[PDB]
């Protein structure tokens with residue numbers, strides 16, 4: 001069975017600076033591929049490297065970029081042209097249309113209308129094959145563009161081969177960073193020139209300069225095909241040559257089938273049925289986007305063993321390494337999805353995280369490819385602990401624990417988002433104050449407290465001294481330090497203990513990150529009952545949640561000085577202040593379950609799934625963020641969500657399809673049967689798990705893994721009695 005047919009790599013490409021609809025590019029690649037490949041419509045250096053509304057492609061580009069904000073590294077490109085050998089990125093460009101383009105995850109084709117050239121590419125994990133179909137012409141060429149900021153190129157005509165390295169990056173690399181590439185053509189050069197800062201130099205073989213390039217050329221008959229085998233490495237030219245063997249001598253068709261098989265292997269772990277074509281495309285496009293980041297950053301030595309260039313200390317070292325993800329996004333449900341469906345893959349990643357700590361002194365929070373200053377929190381603790389508690393255990397648990405502890409009492413001197421900014425105040429006062437020059441203080445506080453609960457869980461598990469366990473149990477409860485009875489919301493607190501004024505729940509940024517108090521107050525993943533206890537009890541809590549949907553999207557943007565696209569995105573959706581692209585609020589709707597009204601979660605979750613995700617080029621409602629926003633739909637369409645990674649629980653929502661079958665790596669399968677599901681029947685009337693009544697608002701990891709059948713009776717009427725009982729409630733720390 002094929003699932004790739006439903007994957008649209010263009011979903012999210014119709015995005016602008018002012019309004020994101022995903023901010024993605026078409027990542028042509030193997031799952032978690034070390035090297036991605038994309039058509040490039042944007043000018044070199046532009047974070048918007050492919051936009052759906054662009055008229056012209058100016059190259060096909062090796063990319064590692066996780067987002068337009070973080071931008072790129074290890075990047076070079078190739079572009080076929082006819083006529084005059086031109087290097088200029090604008091002059092060599094070509095009109096195309098999407099009806100002349102075929103984008104799949106394993107294969108990409110496009111007709112370059114101004115050169116009368118067809119380009120096809122099929123990647124492997126670290127390499128890629130190009131096939132250019134040229135017209136009849138005496139002057140056909142291929143441009144290789146190593147990008148600027150210091151690059152290298154060398155044409156080796158005796159081998160029909162061009163090699164080089166690129167260094168242009170966006171920070172977070174060691175001084176010695178290079179991406180080494182090699183390109184072999186199957187047609188001999190008749191024309192050769194290197195390029196040095198815009199200057200065409202015929203028969204000069206070699207450049208070391210700010211912006212190196214090459215152009216090779218030959219004569220072509222009508223429809224003549226020319227193949228270019230390409231690979232790169234972060235280690236050496238010699239390792240690049242080894243990575244080339246991924247291609248063997250396979251042609252385009254062979255590699256397309258191998259890539260298609262690789263994707264079907266992981267896509268096929270979740271089979272959905274009884275939906276419409278929009279829902280199949282959204283679902284699988286989302287699952288595809290959830291299996292890309294963080295990318296492998298390791299390579300195979302002569303003995304088939306993992307080695308990697310360290311983006312942290314620039315040495316080449318043994319073992320696994322991954323990068324290009326920000327945990328502030330991906331701790332919520334992206335990594336949890338791997339612990340559920342692809343634990344053998346997260347095992348590699350977790351080993352990589354150990355190596356990151358050994359090589360840099362800290363666990364990463366945002367990495368691209370080394371430590372990068374972006375977002376907030378210490379959510380690596382969630383990543384690490386959720387995996388461990390789910391049976392994804394690193395070899396060296398002693399080092400893992402020391403790493404976590406180190407992170408609670410240090411901040412990276414160079415990257416303020418690595419480790420814990422403000423730990424000093426936080427350990428002493430139980431919160432990061434509002435008036436000590438540390439922005440996004442409330443957001444850091446709330447996530448630190450959750451992170452500290454995750455540490456608490458591991459400590460209790462590992463049988464650390466009571467003194468230690470107690471300390472993190474206490475810190476876990478630190479979120480209350482920022483709760484304001486007067487507003488019933490979280491609120492910046494000054495260093496002297498007074499709450500900040502004037503206070504406005506509608507002010508974005510400042511105390512919070514990417515949102516306002518209305519977005520961030522719900523960030524008590526590990527103790528929602530505790531929050532409910534603060535907000536006046538469960539009826540008052542539901543009232544507060546209900547009002548998020550009902551309050552006009554007015555905002556105060558003064559902290560940014562402009563309507564950043566996240567704000568705009570909130571306003572246009574007509575869902576009050578519920579901004580689904582806003583990560584901190586993505587679990588919020590599931591909180592209805594904890595206050596005993598799961599029918600409201602069922603209602604709103606279905607609104608979000610039906611309205612905030614579409615299958616087209618403008619498919620998301622905000623930034624996709626390396627799998628987080630897509631994985632949100634994968635879990636939600638299945639009917640549940642890891643509200644609190646670190647527990648074994650998924651909190652119930654409402655399933656989107658009539659049937660879903662999970663194929664676990666342990667060889668068990670789980671069918672989720674909801675035969676009466678429809679556009680109207682989005683309420684859960686009743687549920688059973690392998691014959692037994694199931695009125696609880698959560699499913700357990702260990703139960704799902706035993707496989708079997710969950711049956712869900714769907715209905716157009718809410719069941720006001722189901723799931724209202726204390727024994728029905730998911731985990732809350734204060735009830736432990």
Ligand SMILES: CO[C@H]1O[C@H](CO)[C@@H](O)[C@H](O)[C@@H]1S[C@H]1O[C@H](CO)[C@@H](O)[C@H](O)[C@@H]1O
Pocket residue numbers: 066067068069070326328329374375564565566583623625
């Ligand atoms: C500099 O760009 C960041 O901040 C501005 C506002 O200060 C935002 O408008 C912009 O979207 C990003 S935050 C953005 O990117 C992060 C890193 O890719 C990502 O983790 C976060 O979820 C968000 O999408």
Ligand SMILES: [Ca+2]
Pocket residue numbers: 329581582583623625
């Ligand atoms: Ca985001």
